[PDB]
Amino acid sequence: QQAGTATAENHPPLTWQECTAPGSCTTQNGAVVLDANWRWVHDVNGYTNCYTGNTWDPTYCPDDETCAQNCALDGADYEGTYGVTSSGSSLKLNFVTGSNVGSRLYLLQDDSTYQIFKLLNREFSFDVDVSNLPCGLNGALYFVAMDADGGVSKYPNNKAGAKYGTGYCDSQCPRDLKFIDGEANVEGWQPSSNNANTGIGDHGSCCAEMDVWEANSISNAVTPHPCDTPGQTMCSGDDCGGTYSNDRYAGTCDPDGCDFNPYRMGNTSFYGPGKIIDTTKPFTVVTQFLTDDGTDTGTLSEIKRFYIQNSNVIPQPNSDISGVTGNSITTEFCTAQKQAFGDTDDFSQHGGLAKMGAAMQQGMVLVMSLWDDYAAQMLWLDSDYPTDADPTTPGIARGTCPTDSGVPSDVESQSPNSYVTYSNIKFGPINSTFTA
Numbered sequence: 001q002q003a004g005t006a007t008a009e010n011h012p013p014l015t016w017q018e019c020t021a022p023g024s025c026t027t028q029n030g031a032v033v034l035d036a037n038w039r040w041v042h043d044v045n046g047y048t049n050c051y052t053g054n055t056w057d058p059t060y061c062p063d064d065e066t067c068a069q070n071c072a073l074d075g076a077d078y079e080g081t082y083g084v085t086s087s088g089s090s091l092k093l094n095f096v097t098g099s100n101v102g103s104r105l106y107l108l109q110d111d112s113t114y115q116i117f118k119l120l121n122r123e124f125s126f127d128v129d130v131s132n133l134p135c136g137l138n139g140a141l142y143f144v145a146m147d148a149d150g151g152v153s154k155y156p157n158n159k160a161g162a163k164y165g166t167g168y169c170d171s172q173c174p175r176d177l178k179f180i181d182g183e184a185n186v187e188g189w190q191p192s193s194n195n196a197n198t199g200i201g202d203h204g205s206c207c208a209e210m211d212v213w214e215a216n217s218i219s220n221a222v223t224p225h226p227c228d229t230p231g232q233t234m235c236s237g238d239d240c241g242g243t244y245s246n247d248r249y250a251g252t253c254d255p256d257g258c259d260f261n262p263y264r265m266g267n268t269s270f271y272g273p274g275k276i277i278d279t280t281k282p283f284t285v286v287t288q289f290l291t292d293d294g295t296d297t298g299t300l301s302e303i304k305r306f307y308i309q310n311s312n313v314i315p316q317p318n319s320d321i322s323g324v325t326g327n328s329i330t331t332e333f334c335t336a337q338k339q340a341f342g343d344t345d346d347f348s349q350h351g352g353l354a355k356m357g358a359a360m361q362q363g364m365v366l367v368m369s370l371w372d373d374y375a376a377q378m379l380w381l382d383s384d385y386p387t388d389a390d391p392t393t394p395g396i397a398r399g400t401c402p403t404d405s406g407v408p409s410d411v412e413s414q415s416p417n418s419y420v421t422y423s424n425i426k427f428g429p430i431n432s433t434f435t436a
């Protein structure tokens, strides 16, 4: 994709902190950028769309390469079109703005380069307000093994780069992306039946993903997802696997992950409105990525979670699922959880924590997003899933929402002013970001 000139691009600023020890932190002046899929794509020599609704225009896009040469990604009116604002260390993502639904943003080191985090033997903390996230919505904060430059050094026909939010990948090997590896996704494009703005092409973009936070006011989950190749790679067709291929398990990435959602793990009292972590008010989420020998070069061995609300430091609750002990993600936990729930252990198949840690070694980009779910209505996060199962069977119930909830047309109409706000990001050594 070319860099368009019709709408100006300016990245909202966002501060965050690096800490060396508890109470000893310094401020980084970051910024965020909107993902390429949200942008106008048009003729590089004019203003005619290359893509409208969910249709490519063959005049500009007779094939993937020509399309990328002929078409430009343009700038974003962050507040007015996309409902994205920032102030100091706070980033607020509104749900519906006009016809736009949510957003996906990346943290920048500079105007052409994503910030890279090396998570091994480190701790990441942030504050969040999920109070205005009802059933069916997901405010996500997570890491993916994207290239820092958005692909530009590898793919000459990508001139837009990180400045325009190119290069996304995740453990679903998403095929909905309009540009992957300097090519458009026109040649095998199939418009979505239920989303007027989207489709699925032959190309997908795979990489490992550490889902630190997927949540609404009902439920949350923390979920690593390994891939066979840790960093960004292209896949083709149904061999991509992931949510939108014929078979989610056909590819090189684990689409399910090894998840810890306290409600799903048998403690419904812990997280939600008025609960131990009371989602009607903001709180702090701390996540630690521990290694087997406690050093920067050890193998990822344990992912731990603490919450802070009203100055009370509260560990993740223990699992109350038979056979599955503790409050953290480890190989033992993941093996046990898949067995107890009767779920396929695709996590182990794609290298588990060892491959997650390999991705962490490559460096990962911070993503903050807000979305609703055309495939599964977020039922996997906040309801009973699958819907044919007995909600009393361990693993089925993940939150309080009914199985009719979360249909995009319903929640976009009923809760347009929903939002998620992330703030006070802190990163550093274990125990450096909070009062252990």
Ligand SMILES: OC[C@H]1O[C@@H](O[C@H]2[C@H](O)[C@@H](O)[C@H](O[C@H]3[C@H](O)[C@@H](O)[C@H](O[C@H]4[C@H](O)[C@@H](O)[C@H](O[C@H]5[C@H](O)[C@@H](O)[C@H](O)O[C@@H]5CO)O[C@@H]4CO)O[C@@H]3CO)O[C@@H]2CO)[C@H](O)[C@@H](O)[C@@H]1O
Pocket (backbone or CB within 6 Å): 037, 038, 039, 040, 041, 049, 051, 052, 053, 081, 099, 100, 101, 102, 103, 104, 140, 170, 174, 176, 177, 197, 198, 369, 370, 371, 372, 373, 374
């Ligand atoms: O007026 C300006 C300009 O508009 C152009 O039209 C734009 C329009 O402005 C945008 O609102 C619209 O944005 C949608 C994108 O087309 C669409 O691809 C994107 O799809 C999302 C999907 O809705 C969402 O569920 C999905 O969520 C992912 C999360 O982000 C991740 O965190 C999680 O891990 O995984 C989930 C599921 O995959 O992400 C996809 C994107 O990958 O939704 C956008 C918001 O509604 O784009 C239009 C262009 O297509 C118009 O063309 C111009 O003429 C005009 O100037």
Ligand SMILES: *[C@@H]1O[C@H](CO)[C@@H](O[C@@H]2O[C@H](CO)[C@@H](O[C@@H]3O[C@H](CO)[C@@H](O)[C@H](O)[C@@H]3O)[C@H](O)[C@H]2NC(C)=O)[C@H](O)[C@H]1NC(C)=O
Pocket (backbone or CB within 6 Å): 266, 267, 269, 270, 276, 314, 315, 316, 317, 318, 320
């Ligand atoms: C759901 O999860 C919550 C949070 O983990 C559980 O509450 C916690 O239960 C533990 C074990 O009983 C409590 O720990 C104990 O505290 C007492 C008194 O301070 C101390 O004597 C013991 O040595 C132990 O440390 C803990 O206080 C409590 N945490 C909170 C924040 O309330 C709860 O039991 C779980 N509910 C269900 C139904 O499983």
Ligand SMILES: OC[C@H]1O[C@@H](O[C@H]2[C@H](O)[C@@H](O)[C@H](O[C@H]3[C@H](O)[C@@H](O)[C@H](O)O[C@@H]3CO)O[C@@H]2CO)[C@H](O)[C@@H](O)[C@@H]1O
Pocket (backbone or CB within 6 Å): 172, 223, 243, 255, 256, 257, 259, 343, 372, 373, 374, 375, 376, 377, 378, 380, 381, 385, 395
């Ligand atoms: O964000 C990427 C896509 O996510 C899809 O949600 C999936 C979750 O990311 C994944 O962790 C969850 O895995 C389930 C699994 O499907 C189920 O069989 C097992 O019992 O529990 C796992 C943990 O909840 O799967 C869901 C659904 O595929 C979104 O549906 C999709 O829109 C989005 O692009």
Ligand SMILES: *[C@@H]1O[C@H](CO)[C@@H](O[C@@H]2O[C@H](CO)[C@@H](O)[C@H](O)[C@H]2NC(C)=O)[C@H](O)[C@H]1NC(C)=O
Pocket (backbone or CB within 6 Å): 430, 431, 436
């Ligand atoms: C981070 O702080 C925690 C909590 O103070 C430390 O964990 C404690 O470690 C001691 C042994 O060194 C144990 O007796 C306690 O039971 C632990 N508490 C908890 C909550 O786990 C931990 O060692 C610190 N990490 C580092 C790298 O210093």
